[PDB]
Amino acid sequence: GMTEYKLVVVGADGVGKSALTIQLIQNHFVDEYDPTIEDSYRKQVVIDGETCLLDILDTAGQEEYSAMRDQYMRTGEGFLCVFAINNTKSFEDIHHYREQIKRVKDSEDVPMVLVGNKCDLPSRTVDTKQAQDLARSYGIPFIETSAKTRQGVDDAFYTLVREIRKHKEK
Ligand SMILES: Nc1nc2c(-c3c(Cl)cc4c(N5C[C@H]6CC[C@@H](C5)N6)nc(OC[C@@]56CCCN5C[C@H](F)C6)nc4c3F)ccc(F)c2s1
Numbered sequence: 001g002m003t004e005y006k007l008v009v010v011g012a013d014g015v016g017k018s019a020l021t022i023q024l025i026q027n028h029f030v031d032e033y034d035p036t037i038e039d040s041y042r043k044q045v046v047i048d049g050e051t052c053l054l055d056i057l058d059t060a061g062q063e064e065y066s067a068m069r070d071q072y073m074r075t076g077e078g079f080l081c082v083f084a085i086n087n088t089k090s091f092e093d094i095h096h097y098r099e100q101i102k103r104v105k106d107s108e109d110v111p112m113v114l115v116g117n118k119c120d121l122p123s124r125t126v127d128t129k130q131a132q133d134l135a136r137s138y139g140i141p142f143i144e145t146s147a148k149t150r151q152g153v154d155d156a157f158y159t160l161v162r163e164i165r166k167h168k169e170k
């Protein structure tokens with residue numbers, strides 16, 4: 001039987017969470033996917049010889065901290081924390097997203113990858129060095145992506161799968 005991985009994509013509105021998820025599932029860039037739709041998407045992919053069923057939650061909508069929302073987010077096994085390289089605020093919000101994940105998982109060691117999206121744009125405001133220094137302080141990988149060109153998309157999701165797999169085999 002295939003191994004199921006529950007991945008959750010988090011980050012500020014408009015950073016490219018939906019475009020990244022759709023690039024992984026469908027291999028095409030979808031410009032302007034409904035900013036309000038939160039949904040889960042499935043992809044069967046073989047990673048390092050293992051047949052994986054990736055169940056990916058693309059977050060959207062209201063910020064809320066109910067017992068239900070916490071319980072739901074806690075089911076995630078690994079998290080992509082996404083910011084956009086042309087939106088400093090989205091990068092500044094990363095500490096918040098990481099803290100919410102650590103809080104509901106009750107752990108300092110949650111599989112996580114920091115993703116700096118929209119690297120195809122020339123309007124960079126978040127330096128690569130500042131972002132990689134933050135990932136280094138967290139002990140997690142940092143991958144720059146472009147959902148528009150597909151650059152780094154497989155690397156970001158498959159690195160997260162490998163982090164979850166490593167966590168389960170400890
Ligand atoms: N209950 C649990 N939730 C979570 C979350 C979670 C989710 Cl799912 C949504 C939002 C969210 N939304 C989802 C998408 C993107 C933006 C918008 C609202 N639409 N927004 C904010 O923060 C937004 C800001 C601005 C206003 C005040 N906040 C604090 C900072 F200033 C940043 N955090 C969110 C968040 F952390 C993540 C991981 C977990 F494990 C848990 S557990």
Ligand SMILES: Nc1nc2c(ncn2[C@@H]2O[C@H](COP(=O)(O)OP(=O)(O)O)[C@@H](O)[C@H]2O)c(=O)[nH]1
Nearest residue numbers: 013014015016017018019031032118146147148
């Ligand atoms: N140039 C560029 N635009 C992108 C990229 N990813 C997403 N976008 C655009 O940025 C906007 C927000 O993307 P979206 O996927 O809806 O982000 P979400 O709100 O995090 O789900 C849309 O206009 C997307 O088409 C990317 O890598 N490069």
Ligand SMILES: [Mg+2]
Nearest residue numbers: 018034035060
């Ligand atoms: Mg979206």
